[PDB]
Amino acid sequence: AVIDAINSGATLKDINAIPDDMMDDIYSYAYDFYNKGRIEEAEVFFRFLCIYDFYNVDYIMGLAAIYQIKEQFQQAADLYAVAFALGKNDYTPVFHTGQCQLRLKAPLKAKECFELVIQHSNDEKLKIKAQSYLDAIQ
Amino acid sequence: GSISTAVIDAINATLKDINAIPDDMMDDIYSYAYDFYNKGRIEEAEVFFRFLCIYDFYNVDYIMGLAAIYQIKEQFQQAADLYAVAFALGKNDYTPVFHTGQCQLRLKAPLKAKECFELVIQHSNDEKLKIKAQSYLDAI
Ligand SMILES: CSc1[nH]nc(-c2ccc(Cl)cc2)c1C#N
Ligand SMILES: [Cl-]
Ligand SMILES: [Cl-]
């Protein structure tokens, strides 16, 4: 049954391979490892989650955050672009992409990211953070 | 699909990481993909754009070509998802937002579509695209 999803490209979530409440528990445990600084374990758990459902925006954001913490900034930025697309109107991944671009020495790209947050987002606290980066970029 | 390939690659080096296909060859394959597309050979064009997006997913031109094919095929959610990737990457115009609005209308999500068309009117400098977006808004 699982092999069928491997051959059809479907997710494990599409075939309800693990119950909903158990997946919730695994996501909460992943976030616990993350908040405790247990980065290697959080990375295993967020990779597990993204294998289970690679369209879940919160699962992708968790793995992207791990990569950003590990200073794998391009790999983080790649996942953030997917996370943005799947959620359509949440500019948090665009904000974090701006941070990654600064670390990649691409300040004009970073400015474009933070400006996009300011222009489109309805999240006032997020826009405040984005503006503080814009104020600092030369 | 293209998005699942991108995520699996990120979970797990890639072909692009080793410069396995040079720029000029990718340019040629892109032009061949549109040759198929322009002749109505949509299935072959889809294979070629999928090939391009496996090699270099984070490329606005490849993403936009594949999104157009899904919209024509009435695979509206897949099209909307790819248009949003194109916009996030830096696509310097609001055309992917406009087309996402069209897709959301077909998905019976008129409130999502309204948000898309309103973004076009507020932020695009393409006066013709703005008129088109307003005509959809007038109908919602
Ligand atoms: C869920 S309401 C909504 N707000 N913004 C969008 C949006 C933004 C950029 C792009 Cl490229 C496509 C769509 C959207 C949708 N769908
Ligand atoms: Cl959507
Ligand atoms: Cl730059």
Side-chain angles (χ1 to χ4, degrees), chain A residues 1 5-35 37-74 76-104 106-110 112-118 120-124 126-138, chain B residues 1-17 20-24 26-42 44-91 93-107 109-110 112-113 115-121 123-127 129-139:
Chain A
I6 295 167
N7 296 340
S8 70
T11 66
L12 294 178
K13 166 71 179 180
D14 284 342
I15 66 179
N16 303 288
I18 302 176
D20 284 358
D21 55 310
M22 184 73 257
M23 297 297 305
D24 288 353
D25 287 354
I26 295 173
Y27 176 83
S28 184
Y29 304 152
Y31 219 108
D32 287 343
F33 284 128
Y34 180 96
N35 286 336
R38 296 285 294 275
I39 302 307
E40 178 171 61
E41 294 86 355
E43 186 179 55
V44 170
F45 271 45
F46 279 113
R47 285 175 162 158
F48 178 95
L49 292 163
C50 290
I51 292 165
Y52 186 86
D53 183 11
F54 32 79
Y55 299 131
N56 184 311
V57 57
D58 292 315
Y59 298 177
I60 296 168
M61 290 289 289
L63 186 56
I66 286 301
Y67 289 168
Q68 186 175 352
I69 285 171
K70 295 177 71 184
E71 302 190 332
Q72 298 166 359
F73 297 115
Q74 185 66 64
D78 289 349
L79 283 177
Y80 285 134
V82 174
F84 173 75
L86 293 178
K88 303 294 178 310
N89 58 10
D90 178 354
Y91 285 80
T92 302
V94 176
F95 170 79
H96 293 308
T97 299
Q99 296 172 312
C100 292
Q101 294 292 3
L102 283 178
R103 301 295 297 272
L104 294 166
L108 302 181
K109 296 184 193 164
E112 289 275 321
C113 291
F114 296 121
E115 288 180 350
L116 194 69
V117 175
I118 297 301
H120 286 204
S121 181
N122 294 321
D123 181 341
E124 298 288 340
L126 183 72
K127 288 179 293 181
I128 288 176
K129 297 192 214 290
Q131 183 65 56
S132 64
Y133 276 92
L134 278 180
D135 292 340
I137 296 176
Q138 302 298 295
Chain B
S2 296
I3 296 182
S4 58
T5 293
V7 174
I8 293 164
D9 284 348
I11 296 166
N12 300 343
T14 66
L15 293 177
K16 172 155 183 62
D17 284 341
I21 305 177
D23 283 358
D24 51 62
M26 295 287 298
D27 286 351
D28 287 355
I29 295 174
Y30 174 84
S31 66
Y32 305 153
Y34 266 112
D35 288 341
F36 280 119
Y37 181 90
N38 291 339
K39 289 279 294 186
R41 296 282 288 268
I42 301 308
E44 290 85 355
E46 185 182 336
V47 171
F48 272 44
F49 279 111
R50 284 285 298 282
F51 176 99
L52 294 164
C53 288
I54 287 165
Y55 184 85
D56 183 16
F57 180 79
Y58 303 94
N59 183 309
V60 163
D61 298 320
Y62 303 163
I63 292 288
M64 290 291 292
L66 188 56
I69 283 172
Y70 289 153
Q71 187 174 353
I72 286 171
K73 294 177 71 185
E74 301 190 332
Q75 297 166 233
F76 293 115
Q77 186 67 63
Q78 289 172 252
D81 292 349
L82 285 176
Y83 283 128
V85 177
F87 183 74
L89 289 178
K91 179 53 159 169
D93 65 70
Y94 281 79
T95 61
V97 181
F98 171 80
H99 293 307
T100 298
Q102 294 174 311
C103 292
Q104 295 294 5
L105 279 176
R106 302 295 296 270
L107 295 165
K112 295 187 191 166
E115 201 164 272
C116 291
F117 297 125
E118 287 181 350
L119 282 179
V120 174
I121 296 176
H123 299 282
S124 179
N125 291 321
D126 180 339
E127 303 294 350
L129 186 71
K130 290 167 51 187
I131 285 181
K132 296 192 211 191
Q134 183 66 57
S135 64
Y136 282 101
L137 278 182
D138 291 341

